[PDB]
Amino acid sequence: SLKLTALHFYKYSEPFKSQIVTPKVTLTHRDCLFIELIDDKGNAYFGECNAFQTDWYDHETIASVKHVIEQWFEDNRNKSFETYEAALKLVDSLENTPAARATIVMALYQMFHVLPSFSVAYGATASGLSNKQLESLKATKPTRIKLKWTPQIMHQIRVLRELDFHFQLVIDANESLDRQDFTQLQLLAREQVLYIEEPFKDISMLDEVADGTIPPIALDEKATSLLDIINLIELYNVKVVVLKPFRLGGIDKVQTAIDTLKSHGAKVVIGGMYEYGLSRYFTAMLARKGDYPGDVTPAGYYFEQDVVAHSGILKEGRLEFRPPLVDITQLQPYEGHHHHHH
């Protein structure tokens, strides 16, 4: 039997090695909320929140999640629970704030499971094809390469297909294409593209091209909730869904979502978004549940310094994960007298 005795909030904020520049946001740093729940034996368990500092991606922010979790703890502190399933009942009421819910569930999961060490497939991402990028691909031999749609797409695929190893090709089109791209999309179908993520901002454009003449279509940005994913699958010819556990409300919601989406004829890929090494571990752990290898980002891809080191080290085409142990000295109190600045 366990009871929760204390809650602490912390912040981490490392720079992105390369500034993030997208139509939705510019990010210089990944601001991130961490929670620590301490049980009645004095055992501390950490959770990593996937909300951002402002609402550029989603309505839940670091600040909104902090207030939600703080109230949740007031409502649930010192309550006894016997099992993982009893613990999850306590976060039933957080359905409407899935980012907050996922943060708590990440901590609760650790109270009831012995965490394995394991590997997942390495998939590379390329936004273009500089010498630095090409040399990395050649050296690391990924089994999947995700290439960003640009005007150079076909000219770059031709370089990639001369690389001395076979890989699955995914294209990320970033909700950026229009009717003038249909011809190219149809040509792209002859290049063994496993799927294309989000060709169109307006999903109804899929109805304008002959079905089966473009690559299989994935939801990423539009994979916002299980219910809206289902609504889109029932209306349009979507075959692949990129599932981010935090968007579903946490670790515990992933398998049910997968079972349901497979019953509607979709395939699932587990993915993440700008994670530190704590969340990255749980995303990787869940990746084998998907129909295709997960979109797991390697250790060090975004951040020079991490709160959990060695979380997804690339070795011989696979990413290696260890039970994640937060380095407490990297965290800072979120607020109050012990939140300092320099």
UniProtKB/TrEMBL annotation:
Keywords of this protein's UniProt record, alphabetized?
A: Lyase, Magnesium, Menaquinone biosynthesis, Metal-binding
Keyword Metal-binding on entry: yes
Name of a matching Pfam family: MR_MLE_C
User: What are the BP-aspect GO terms?
Assistant: menaquinone biosynthetic process
According to its UniProt record, the EC number is: 4.2.1.113
Entries under SUPFAM superfamilies matching the protein? Enolase C-terminal domain-like (SSF51604), Enolase N-terminal domain-like (SSF54826)
Catalytic residues as annotated in Swiss-Prot or TrEMBL: 148 (proton donor), 244 (proton acceptor)
Give cofactor(s), names only: a divalent metal cation
Molecular-function GO terms, alphabetical: magnesium ion binding; O-succinylbenzoate synthase activity
Binding residues for Mg(2+) = 172, 197, 220
Gene3D superfamilies xrefs: Enolase-like C-terminal domain, Enolase-like, N-terminal domain
Q: Which residues form the Enolase C-terminal domain?
A: 137-317
In which pathway does this enzyme or protein participate?
Answer: Quinol/quinone metabolism; menaquinone biosynthesis; Quinol/quinone metabolism; 1,4-dihydroxy-2-naphthoate biosynthesis; 1,4-dihydroxy-2-naphthoate from chorismate: step 4/7
Q: Which InterPro entries match?
A: Enolase-like_C_sf, Enolase-like_N, Enolase_C-like, MenC, OSBS/NAAAR
Q: What class of enzyme is it?
A: lyase
HAMAP family per record: MenC_2
- What is this protein's function? Converts 2-succinyl-6-hydroxy-2,4-cyclohexadiene-1-carboxylate (SHCHC) to 2-succinylbenzoate (OSB).
Q: Which family does it belong to?
A: Belongs to the mandelate racemase/muconate lactonizing enzyme family. MenC type 2 subfamily.
Please identify the protein, giving its name as recorded. o-succinylbenzoate synthase
Q: Tell me the organism's taxonomic lineage.
A: Bacteria, Bacillati, Bacillota, Bacilli, Bacillales
